[PDB]
Amino acid sequence: MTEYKLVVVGAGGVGKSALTIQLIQNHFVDEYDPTIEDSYRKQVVIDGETCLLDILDTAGQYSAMRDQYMRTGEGFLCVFAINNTKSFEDIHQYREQIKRVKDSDDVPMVLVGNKCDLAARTVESRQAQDLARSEGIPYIETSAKTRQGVEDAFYTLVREIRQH
Ligand SMILES: Nc1nc2c(ncn2[C@@H]2O[C@H](COP(=O)(O)OP(=O)(O)NP(=O)(O)O)[C@@H](O)[C@H]2O)c(=O)[nH]1
Numbered sequence: 001m002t003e004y005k006l007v008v009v010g011a012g013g014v015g016k017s018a019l020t021i022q023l024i025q026n027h028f029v030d031e032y033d034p035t036i037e038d039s040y041r042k043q044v045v046i047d048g049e050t051c052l053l054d055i056l057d058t059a060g061q062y063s064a065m066r067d068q069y070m071r072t073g074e075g076f077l078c079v080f081a082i083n084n085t086k087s088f089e090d091i092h093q094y095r096e097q098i099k100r101v102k103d104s105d106d107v108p109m110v111l112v113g114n115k116c117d118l119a120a121r122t123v124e125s126r127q128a129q130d131l132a133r134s135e136g137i138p139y140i141e142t143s144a145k146t147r148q149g150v151e152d153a154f155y156t157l158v159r160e161i162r163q164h
Pocket residue numbers: 010011012013014015016017018019029030031032033034035036058059060061114115116117118142143144145146
């Protein structure tokens with residue numbers, strides 16, 4: 001079957017793992033558990049097509065160790081947290097590193113604003129929007145906790161790969 005090589009990147013603690021675990025294991029981790037590098041492979045049906053999601057869950061903490069997984073990566077979830085301004089700034093750097101490593105500014109990518117269940121927001125949707133719009137990528141807000149937007153985000157990425 002068709003495989004889609006997805007890579008989840010972003011600053012430490014933004015909820016990259018929680019997002020992936022919600023998608024694959026239908027629950028919210030709700031705990032401290034930093035990632036080194038984890039891989040999930042799940043057979044799904046998206047828009048009637050059987051496919052294998054091969055998802056790489058990466059470290060927000062291993063910078064030269066990033067090139068290799070960006071090289072093979074097919075599409076990228078670029079995650080920040082809407083209560084964490086710094087993480088939104090960092091996500092600029094992730095995108096630039098992906099573009100550089102892959103020698104392309106045409107790599108399938110979704111900008112993800114996670115933790116949208118939290119009231120104490122510090123990153124307005126509008127600024128994330130403008131940034132996404134500027135870069136030619138979709139913007140989707142998620143809550144790994146309530147599952148809001150989680151399938152939207154991952155499936156949109158898959159469709160962005162099919163549309164490439
Ligand atoms: N309220 C809320 N908390 C979330 C959400 N996603 C993750 N968290 C919480 O935020 C923390 C970080 O989650 P985690 O998934 O480990 O982040 P990460 O980006 O994978 N971290 P790392 O880069 O170190 O692997 C945990 O306490 C987790 O339960 C979310 O959507 N909402």
